[PDB]
Amino acid sequence: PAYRILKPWWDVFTDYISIVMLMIAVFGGTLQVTQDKMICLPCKWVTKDSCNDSTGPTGIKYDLDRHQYNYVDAVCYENRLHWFAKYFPYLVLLHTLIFLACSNFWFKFPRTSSKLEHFVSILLKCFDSPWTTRALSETGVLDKKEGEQAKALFEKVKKFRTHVEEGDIVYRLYMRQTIIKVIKFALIICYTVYYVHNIKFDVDCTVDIESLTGYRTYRCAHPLATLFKILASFYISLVIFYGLICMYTLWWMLRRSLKKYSFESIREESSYSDIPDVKNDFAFMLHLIDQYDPLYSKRFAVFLSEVSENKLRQLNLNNEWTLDKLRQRLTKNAQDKLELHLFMLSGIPDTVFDLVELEVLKLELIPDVTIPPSIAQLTGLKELWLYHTAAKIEAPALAFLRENLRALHIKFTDIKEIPLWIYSLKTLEELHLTGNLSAENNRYIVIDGLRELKRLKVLRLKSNLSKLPQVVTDVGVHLQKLSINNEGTKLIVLNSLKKMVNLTELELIRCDLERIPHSIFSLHNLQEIDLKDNNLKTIEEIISFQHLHRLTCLKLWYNHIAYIPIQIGNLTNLERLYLNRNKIEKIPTQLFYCRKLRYLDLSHNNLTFLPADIGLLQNLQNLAVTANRIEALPPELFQCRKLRALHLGNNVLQSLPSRVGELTNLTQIELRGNRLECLPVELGECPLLKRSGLVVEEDLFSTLPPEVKERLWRADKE
Amino acid sequence: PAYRILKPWWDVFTDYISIVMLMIAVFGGTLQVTQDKMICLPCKWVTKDSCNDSTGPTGIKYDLDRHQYNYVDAVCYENRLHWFAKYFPYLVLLHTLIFLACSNFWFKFPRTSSKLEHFVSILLKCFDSPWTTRALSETGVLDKKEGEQAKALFEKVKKFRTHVEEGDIVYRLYMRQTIIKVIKFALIICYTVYYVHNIKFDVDCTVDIESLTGYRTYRCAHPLATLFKILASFYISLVIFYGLICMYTLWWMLRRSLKKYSFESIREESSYSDIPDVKNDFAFMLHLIDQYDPLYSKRFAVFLSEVSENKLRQLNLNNEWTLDKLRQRLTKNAQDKLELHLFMLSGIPDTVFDLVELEVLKLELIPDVTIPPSIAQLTGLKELWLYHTAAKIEAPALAFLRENLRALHIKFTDIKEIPLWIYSLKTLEELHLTGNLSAENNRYIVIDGLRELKRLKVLRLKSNLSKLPQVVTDVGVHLQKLSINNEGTKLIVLNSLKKMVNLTELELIRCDLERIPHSIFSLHNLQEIDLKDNNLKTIEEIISFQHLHRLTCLKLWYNHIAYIPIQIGNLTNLERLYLNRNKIEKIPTQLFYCRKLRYLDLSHNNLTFLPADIGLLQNLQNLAVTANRIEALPPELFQCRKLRALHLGNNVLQSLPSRVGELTNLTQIELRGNRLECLPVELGECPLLKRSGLVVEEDLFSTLPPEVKERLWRADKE
């Protein structure tokens, strides 16, 4: 009912031939059992154990009782009848039983029976699956249950292939059965043809029975001899057909090396070129099914293609993640735009394009993903993150992003991972590059197309570059903010900054320059400048910084600066100053000449004293002197009531002056890490400073007056 | 188990006839086995190997024992009884078995058994399909899974047809089987009719056994001979019927040329000419099923016709997208026009034309759309948007569109996918081209039909063109509005804009001119000019702007203009002029000669304070200096009474002048990102200012007195 698919035409023909042989055997057996008598008459004149056949004629008197005739018949039948005539039906019954056993040996051998049952069940599953139909049709949307069932079928197929690949028992067992059938046919043909001529109607008998009858020899007649001869010839012809069929099977087994399956036809005509050529013990069962019907093999092809696996994986992925689950996965980033981050997925779920509220999409380790056009449903998309994903795109989505995308982030370890189509994103304004780009004789080759980014305004370079790309210098004609992170690689300007005259922010982090380039000063449009981690020692180049009439903020944090040049007194244009984590030891008075200053951090330095001129900078809002050696505070500092916060931590401030409460606009303090005796009570008179804004160790905190404790706590509550 | 559907009436009759033949075969066989004795007597007077046939009568004494009679019977039965009388039933059994084997060969031959079971399975699937019931009843909405299974059935039918039309095995096998049946019938009837005469009741046997009985020849009676004779006559009659039926089947197979099926009645009973001529190995099963009955063939032919599949799949689409679902998804676009979006649909739902209330429709990513005449149902439709949707049009559809269309948007990724009929329309007022049509050596030829748009007035050409096509200038002799966006590509004018005398609103977006061409100056009737991000640096050409007498609006922002020339004040006609996002640092007093100016934007510029002359332009209502370096608000600006918006957010404003309450018409105020400590109270006396209208930080918003905040909240509430 189910294994009939596994029976080629030769097998079913041999089964029918065996059934016919069995019918012949049972008919001959019942015929011989019911009546197989001999009829014997004695030879009156006999020589050489055979009589010579020598008014009206009269009968011959033998003077024998009927029982004497019966006794002679029995004796001659048991003795002088050829054993072939006596035992032909049982012989053919035994031979056909052996043939049936040989046919069914591999079916009843559990070691290969389990493999055959698994093969047939899996082949039926692959034949009746709905996924293979659509896979062949394509050369979509489906239910959860059917998708997971199809996935289970795929993994069962892989397990079955692993199991049957190393077996190589079915092929040799089939060879053994075919050889056994062939040799049985050969011996049967030889001996049966040799002995068939030994059954005949006339037979002679000489049994040395005189004391019971008185005659020596008898001419016996075997009435069933001719019918048995006809049955024997019919059976011999049947065995000849059986042997011819078995020999054809043997030849079929030895003309194409059935151990190996070509598989080329369907793997090339269905465009699934990634279909393996099947190997031993698995090519053979596929050959058998081909002999039944190649359509089953064609259906089973799509479960080894290695590509249909990707298709099913992405389809089940699209099935699983629902828009509700994605919204629960939705997060708000630092820049306060609606964010969904995809990490370590085989592909992009299609339901992510159902969230019209999405603004920024991230792709972290997503292999072989091509952007579907359904991205058009995402109106708010402005930022796209490529965290180590080489992603392709099609024309409609490409145009949609060309007209809609504003920010792009590329994190890569290889240049080939960069999507070549990004250069058409003519509405792109901000791009972030992470990954080395220098190539042996092909460095700065991919980025030549950056001239196409006409609306580019922000660029992030993290590639350990030693010479700045010329194309960057060219495109900087409209750039407004440029950030580079060489991560320890020394960068040489080679006077390649005097063409990005539109730049308004220049950040050079970990570029290891050790000097301030002169082309910085030529950018009079600059406003904010940083020289992080370039091991700066002397910043006297600020002499040429007076050309920068609109330089507002300057950062020299995390450098090796030891002193503040007096020239900064001339550049009063500064509004934010960052100099922490340097080796600066003292504050010259000239620094206090920038009266419009609003931010000042001098943390992590060798500073020991605070000059009194700090009070001259009324607009200062925050102060940071963390990790310094200041022990006492000049009271003039407390004349800047508009100082919202101050960072005195990790210092050696012995005692806080009581004027601190005069700073009403103050809201935050840093006091942990300093050797203080008791907190001033006047500190608790600040209208806006709260326990949240009051940072200090608990031992100094408990010395606060109880009214101060209650006021700070109630400010924290509300 | 409806396998008999492939058995015609004659196959059934042959089966029954074979059953009867086998029945008489087993009857004759068991009769011959049980009793076939031939009773022989010697005759004393022999003439020519035969009995001469020559006081009361007395018997004849032959002097033979019973056993000698038995021996004579055996020998004469063996030798001189004609073999036909002995072996008639076995021959009948053999022939009946051969006939049954021929009849069931194709059922039991696995190669063709596979195709036959495949065909019967798919046919039984098709017969029970409600799709057939609905299609034949057509001569309303059901389950989606029903449409899906119908489409899957269509696909599997296509795949099977592709599989089986090339085989040509079942026909040749059936032909060979029926030929074998007929030739076997001929041979058997020949020999049986010839040899049935030897079934005689009495037979003379001359055997030459003298030494055993002493009689030369014997007369024998075969008692069963007459019964065998009538059995053989009956068998001959049955074989005659069987052979006549097989001859009829041969005639049926050799007159209709069964290799090709007709499928002709379909196009006259259901007007379905969507059915091919079925080739070999598939017409055969169709013919056989027809011989059963044609109802199955008819109810199966529908699944072959692709047009019926398309129409009922469209029915399924309508089942998914019902009219109420459409109106639920119905939206209004920004231009106050009822619009529905059809994004990534397989085909146009038919129900959409039940809603005449639509005037704008957008078709994006809907493959192979052919515009139906049912678009005539939508009278008020005026605008259609084509997004990557190559559309074929119909004559009623083209007629309706050439007289009931006002504006058209077509976007295309390739030249070949533009519909060619669009130029033929005459009522089209607005055409929107969005797609790179740049071609080499045959540029501006694909749109050579552009001159056929005689009612065109508004034209949007976003095609990344290097120079303006001459055909565009040809059509521009009568146009009104032209919008060009080259996406950063430089636009070449070269005396190709002075011919658009009737243009009313000119817009150049990222045309990369970098310098205003003189051509615009010849267009006196022009009203509004835009140069969005055309990399402009010098705008001296505004001196020639006095040629444009009615020029009231100017758009030059998103450019790199640093200094405003004075002579722009000579244009008193100006009404709205935004100049944000430029390098403007000081507004010349001459610019304030444009007394009729009403809307001004100066955001993202480098101003520090404002000239007094702005107070003299009372006609202004909207001012925008957002995100700038304006130190303080000059009070003279309060003299412009009808100001309803002041976009002053993100400035360096320190203290807001109290005269803000002087603006009664003041509606919207944005002040985020300003260094403002305290707010004036007059801000709460503005009748048209509301809490949403006033954009200010909530903690800073709490600086206002409680009455101010309460009044603003009450005004905003209703």
**Cα dihedral sign, B89-B94-B98-B100:** positive
| Residues in chain B, overall count | 718
Neighbours of A636 (CB within 10 A): 15
User: Cα dist. A597→A614, A622, A689, A717 in Å?
Assistant: 11, 10, 22, 34
Give the closest-approach CA distance of B501 to chain A in angstroms.
32
Residue type, B487: E
- Ordered strands of the B217-221 beta sheet: B39-42, B217-221, B202-206
Q: CA-CA distance, B578 to B553, in Å (whole number)? A: 9
DSSP state of A467: B
Taking contacts as CB-CB distances below 8 angstroms, the residues of chain A near B488 are: 426, 452, 454-455
Place of tokens 């709460």: B684
Task: Give the best residue of B43, B67, B677 to mutate against chain A (max A CB count within 10 A).
Answer: B67
Coil, helix or strand for B651?
coil
In sequence order, the 6+-apart residues with CB closer than 8 A to the CB of A314 are A346, A347
| End-to-end alpha carbon distance in chain B | 77
Interface membership of B209 toward A (CB under 8 Å)? yes
Give the closest-approach CA distance of A537 to chain B in angstroms.
34
Interface membership of A3 toward B (CB under 8 Å)? no
Q: CA-CA distance, A527 to A505, in Å (whole number)? A: 6
Per-residue three-class SS string for B701-714: HCCCCHHHHHHHHH
Interface membership of B216 toward A (CB under 8 Å)? yes
CB of A492 within 8 A of CB of A517? no
DSSP state of B282: T
In sequence order, the 6+-apart residues with CB closer than 8 A to the CB of B251 are none
Interface list for A 459-478 with B (CB within 8 A):
478
Q: Classify the phi-psi angles of A253: left when phi > 0, otherwise alpha if psi is within -120 to 50, otherwise beta.
A: alpha
Kindly report the backbone phi and psi dihedral angles of residue B179, in degrees, each rounded to the nearest multiple of 5, phi listed first: -60, -40
Q: How many CB pairs under 8 A join A and B?
A: 136
Kindly report the backbone phi and psi dihedral angles of residue B308, in degrees, each rounded to the nearest multiple of 5, phi listed first: -65, -40
Per-residue three-class SS string for A491-540: CECCCCCCCCCCCCEEEEECCCCCCCCCHHHHCCCCCEEECCCCCCCCCH
Which of these, A111, A95, A243, lies nearest to A172 by C-alpha position?
A: A111
Q: CA-CA distance, A665 to A644, in Å (whole number)? A: 6
CA–chain centroid gap for A43, Å, is 95
CA–chain centroid gap for B601, Å, is 51
CB of A711 within 8 A of CB of A684? yes
Coil, helix or strand for B457?
coil
Interface membership of A61 toward B (CB under 8 Å)? yes
Judged by CB atoms closer than 8 Å, whether chains meet at A426 and B488 is answered as: yes
Place of tokens 């030897």: B198
Task: Give the best residue of A14, A227, A356, A456 to mutate against chain B (max B CB count within 10 A).
Answer: A227
DSSP state of B201: S
Neighbours of B113 (CB within 10 A): 20
Taking contacts as CB-CB distances below 8 angstroms, the residues of chain B near A226 are: 78
Interface membership of B65 toward A (CB under 8 Å)? yes
CB of B334 within 8 A of CB of B362? no
Judged by CB atoms closer than 8 Å, whether chains meet at A54 and B215 is answered as: no
Task: Give the best residue of B33, B47, B65 to mutate against chain A (max A CB count within 10 A).
Answer: B65
Taking contacts as CB-CB distances below 8 angstroms, the residues of chain A near B163 are: 295
Torsion of CA A384, A385, A389, A392, to 10 degrees: 10
Question: What is the token pair recorded at B519?
Answer: 């051509």
Coil, helix or strand for A46?
strand
Interface list for B 573-602 with A (CB within 8 A):
none
Which of these, A437, A439, A441, lies nearest to A460 by C-alpha position?
A: A437
Give the closest-approach CA distance of B698 to chain A in angstroms.
15
Which of these, B591, B592, B594, lies nearest to B561 by C-alpha position?
A: B591
DSSP for B304-357 reads T-HHHHHHHHHHHHHHHS-HHHHHHH-EE-TTS-EEEEEES-SS--GGGGG-TT
CA–chain centroid gap for B490, Å, is 41
User: Cα dist. B389→B275, B332, B366 in Å?
Assistant: 29, 22, 6
In sequence order, the 6+-apart residues with CB closer than 8 A to the CB of A438 are A444, A463, A464, A465, A466
Resolution, rounded to a tenth of an Å? 3.8
B345 → chain A, closest CA residue:
A374
Alpha helix ranges (H) inside A254-293: 264-269, 283-292
Q: What angle is formed at CA A116 by the lines to CA A115 and CA A120, rounded to 5 degrees?
A: 120
Place of tokens 């950018």: A523
Question: What is the token pair recorded at B665?
Answer: 């018409």
Which own/partner contact pairs does A323-332 have at CB distance under 8 Å and 24+ positions apart?
A323/A351, A323/A354, A323/A355, A326/A351, A326/A352, A326/A354, A326/A355, A327/A355, A330/A355, A330/A357, A330/A358
Question: What is the token pair recorded at A547?
Answer: 């050309």
Q: What angle is formed at CA A544 by the lines to CA A569 and CA A590, rounded to 5 degrees?
A: 10
Coil, helix or strand for A169?
coil
Give the closest-approach CA distance of B678 to chain A in angstroms.
13
CB of A435 within 8 A of CB of A459? no
Question: What is the token pair recorded at A285?
Answer: 């069962």
Structure determined by: cryo-EM
Kindly report the backbone phi and psi dihedral angles of residue A218, in degrees, each rounded to the nearest multiple of 5, phi listed first: -140, 135
Taking contacts as CB-CB distances below 8 angstroms, the residues of chain B near A552 are: none
Taking contacts as CB-CB distances below 8 angstroms, the residues of chain A near B214 are: 57-60
In sequence order, the 6+-apart residues with CB closer than 8 A to the CB of B661 are B680, B681, B682, B683, B684, B685, B686
Q: Classify the phi-psi angles of B390: left when phi > 0, otherwise alpha if psi is within -120 to 50, otherwise beta.
A: beta
Judged by CB atoms closer than 8 Å, whether chains meet at A69 and B74 is answered as: no
Per-residue three-class SS string for A389-428: CCCEECHHHHHHHHHHCCEEEEECCCHHHCCHHHHHCCCC
Residue type, B496: S
Question: What is the token pair recorded at B549?
Answer: 């007498």
Kindly report the backbone phi and psi dihedral angles of residue B334, in degrees, each rounded to the nearest multiple of 5, phi listed first: -65, -15
Coil, helix or strand for B521?
helix
Place of tokens 């404790």: A709
Kindly report the backbone phi and psi dihedral angles of residue B543, in degrees, each rounded to the nearest multiple of 5, phi listed first: -60, -40
Taking contacts as CB-CB distances below 8 angstroms, the residues of chain B near A217 are: none
- Residue B78, judged by CB atoms within 10 A of its CB (0-12, 13-18, 19+), counts as buried
Place of tokens 């440029």: A482
DSSP for A307-328 reads SHHHHHHHHHHHHH--HHHHHH
DSSP for A345-389 reads -SS--GGGGG-TT--EEEEES-TT-EE-GGGGG-TT--EEEEES-
Interface membership of B163 toward A (CB under 8 Å)? yes
Q: CA-CA distance, B410 to B361, in Å (whole number)? A: 12
Question: What is the token pair recorded at B261?
Answer: 């099926």
In sequence order, the 6+-apart residues with CB closer than 8 A to the CB of B468 are B484, B491, B492, B493, B496, B497
Q: CA-CA distance, B163 to B118, in Å (whole number)? A: 11
CB of A481 within 8 A of CB of A502? no
Question: What is the token pair recorded at A359?
Answer: 């603004």
Number of H helices, E strands in chain B: 18, 22
User: Cα dist. B526→A376, A626, B210, B519, B545 in Å?
Assistant: 36, 65, 143, 12, 11
User: Cα dist. B317→A143, A369, B360, B384 in Å?
Assistant: 18, 29, 22, 22
Exposure b/e, B268-307, CB count within 10 A at least 16 = b: eebebebbeebebbbbbbbbbbbbeeeebbbbbbbbbbee
Q: CA-CA distance, A714 to A520, in Å (whole number)? A: 51
Interface membership of A12 toward B (CB under 8 Å)? yes
Question: What is the token pair recorded at A472?
Answer: 């960057």
Number of H helices, E strands in chain A: 18, 24
Q: CA-CA distance, B514 to A370, in Å (whole number)? A: 38
In sequence order, the 6+-apart residues with CB closer than 8 A to the CB of B19 are none
A36 → chain B, closest CA residue:
B33
Question: What is the token pair recorded at B554?
Answer: 């100017």
Strands B622-624 and B645-647: parallel
Interface membership of B217 toward A (CB under 8 Å)? no
Q: Which of A4, A31, A377 sits opposite B33 (nearest CB)?
A: A31
Strands A331-332 and A360-364: unpaired
Interface membership of A618 toward B (CB under 8 Å)? no
Which of these, B686, B688, B679, lies nearest to B657 by C-alpha position?
A: B679
Neighbours of A138 (CB within 10 A): 11
In sequence order, the 6+-apart residues with CB closer than 8 A to the CB of B358 are B330, B338, B339, B340, B352, B378, B380, B381
**Cα dihedral sign, B129-B133-B138-B141:** negative
Question: What is the token pair recorded at A145?
Answer: 């249950």
DSSP for B101-140 reads HHHHHHHH-HHHHHHHHHHHHHHHHHHT-HHHHHHHHH--
Q: Which of A59, A66, A478 sits opposite B215 (nearest CB)?
A: A59
Task: Give the best residue of A15, A30, A39, A599 to mutate against chain B (max B CB count within 10 A).
Answer: A39
B608 → chain A, closest CA residue:
A550
A299 → chain B, closest CA residue:
B159
Q: Which of B44, B79, B110 sits opposite A57 (nearest CB)?
A: B44
Which of these, A525, A516, A521, A522, lies nearest to A493 by C-alpha position?
A: A516
DSSP for B399-446 reads HHHTTS--EEEEE-SSGGGS-GGGGG-SS--EEEEES----SSSTT-T
Interface list for B 659-698 with A (CB within 8 A):
none
| Residues in chain A, overall count | 718
Judged by CB atoms closer than 8 Å, whether chains meet at B62 and A59 is answered as: yes
Taking contacts as CB-CB distances below 8 angstroms, the residues of chain B near A502 are: 560
**Cα dihedral sign, A143-A149-A152-A154:** negative
Residue type, B155: E
Residue type, B302: V
In sequence order, the 6+-apart residues with CB closer than 8 A to the CB of A24 are A89, A92, A231, A234, A235, A238
Question: What is the token pair recorded at A703?
Answer: 């010395």
Q: CA-CA distance, A44 to A61, in Å (whole number)? A: 10
Task: Give the best residue of A54, A132, A245, A426 to mutate against chain B (max B CB count within 10 A).
Answer: A426
Q: CA-CA distance, B256 to B291, in Å (whole number)? A: 13
Q: CA-CA distance, A428 to A410, in Å (whole number)? A: 13
Exposure b/e, B420-456, CB count within 10 A at least 16 = b: ebbbebeebbbbbbbbbbeeeeeebebbeebeebeeb
Neighbours of B19 (CB within 10 A): 11
Give the closest-approach CA distance of A513 to chain B in angstroms.
31
Question: What is the token pair recorded at B285?
Answer: 């099963």
Kindly report the backbone phi and psi dihedral angles of residue A313, in degrees, each rounded to the nearest multiple of 5, phi listed first: -60, -50
Strands B331-332 and B338-343: antiparallel
| End-to-end alpha carbon distance in chain A | 81
Taking contacts as CB-CB distances below 8 angstroms, the residues of chain A near B87 are: 230
In sequence order, the 6+-apart residues with CB closer than 8 A to the CB of B54 are B45
Kindly report the backbone phi and psi dihedral angles of residue B23, in degrees, each rounded to the nearest multiple of 5, phi listed first: -65, -50
